[PDB]
Amino acid sequence: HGFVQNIVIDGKNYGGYLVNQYPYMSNPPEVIAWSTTATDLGFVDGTGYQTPDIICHRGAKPGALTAPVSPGGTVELQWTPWPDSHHGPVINYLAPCNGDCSTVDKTQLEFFKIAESGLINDDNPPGIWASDNLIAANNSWTVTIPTTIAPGNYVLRHEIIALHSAQNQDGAQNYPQCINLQVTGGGSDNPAGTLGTALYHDTDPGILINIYQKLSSYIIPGPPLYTG
Numbered sequence: 001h002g003f004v005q006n007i008v009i010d011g012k013n014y015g016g017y018l019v020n021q022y023p024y025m026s027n028p029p030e031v032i033a034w035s036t037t038a039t040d041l042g043f044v045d046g047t048g049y050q051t052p053d054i055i056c057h058r059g060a061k062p063g064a065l066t067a068p069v070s071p072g073g074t075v076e077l078q079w080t081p082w083p084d085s086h087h088g089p090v091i092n093y094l095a096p097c098n099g100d101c102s103t104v105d106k107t108q109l110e111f112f113k114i115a116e117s118g119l120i121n122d123d124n125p126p127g128i129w130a131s132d133n134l135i136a137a138n139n140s141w142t143v144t145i146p147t148t149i150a151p152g153n154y155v156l157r158h159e160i161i162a163l164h165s166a167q168n169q170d171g172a173q174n175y176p177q178c179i180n181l182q183v184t185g186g187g188s189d190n191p192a193g194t195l196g197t198a199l200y201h202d203t204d205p206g207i208l209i210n211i212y213q214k215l216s217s218y219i220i221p222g223p224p225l226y227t228g
């Protein structure tokens with residue numbers, strides 16, 4: 001359980017969608033982060049992978065604001081403290097807005113994977129995962145926006161999948177957090193995109209999995225990494 005509380009770009013903080021404060025207001029502020037209804041700080045499980053909730057979390061609506069990123073620039077997402085028990089991959093996707101991200105129909109977004117990290121070491125099962133790397137970085141993740149993609153407005157969909165209950169059907173816990181970016185630079189690629197509702201299925205080999213046994217490999221879920 002947790003959420004993204006802050007985003008660092010170009011030497012400043014963009015405040016996140018503080019899901020334990022803003023939902024409790026009739027007049028919340030404008031941010032780059034999407035609003036959600038996930039006030040339990042929880043997850044979308046396999047029962048929701050083909051509902052709109054998987055796209056940018058439960059009841060999500062676009063952020064009003066969009067943050068500019070320098071060409072090949074970094075986006076640092078700062079989480080609430082991630083529990084060590086919640087072992088799993090950290091995955092990052094972009095989808096183009098083809099206009100202002102604030103007015104997009106989330107159900108039409110087509111995501112391409114720009115980064116993935118999974119099982120890092122398995123010397124002592126359940127081992128050390130991308131989520132443990134995030135904890136070791138003081139609950140921060142660094143995303144480099146590719147230089148080879150077409151610039152424009154994009155949704156960044158940044159996600160932890162916790163696997164501590166993933167040996168039973170619909171036990172994996174997805175934690176997607178979306179923010180609006182203005183990608184800048186000289187790139188041209190328009191990568192093949194996947195609908196949010198086709199990213200994951202509740203029987204995928206990296207989703208329905210017992211992490212407590214020795215693993216020889218881990219197949220990171222979702223469509224193939226874009227490498228440009």
Ligand SMILES: *[C@@H]1O[C@H](CO)[C@@H](O)[C@H](O)[C@H]1NC(C)=O
Binds near residue numbers: 136
């Ligand atoms: C994170 O930073 C704090 C100090 O602000 C430090 O005490 C702590 O050990 C750091 N955590 C890790 C895992 O490096």
Ligand SMILES: O=C(CO)CO
Binds near residue numbers: 165
């Ligand atoms: O999430 C869990 C308890 O915190 C296990 O399913």
Ligand SMILES: [Cl-]
Binds near residue numbers: 039040
């Ligand atoms: Cl609730």
Ligand SMILES: [Cl-]
Binds near residue numbers: 082
């Ligand atoms: Cl922690």
Ligand SMILES: [Cu+2]
Binds near residue numbers: 001002086
């Ligand atoms: Cu949790």
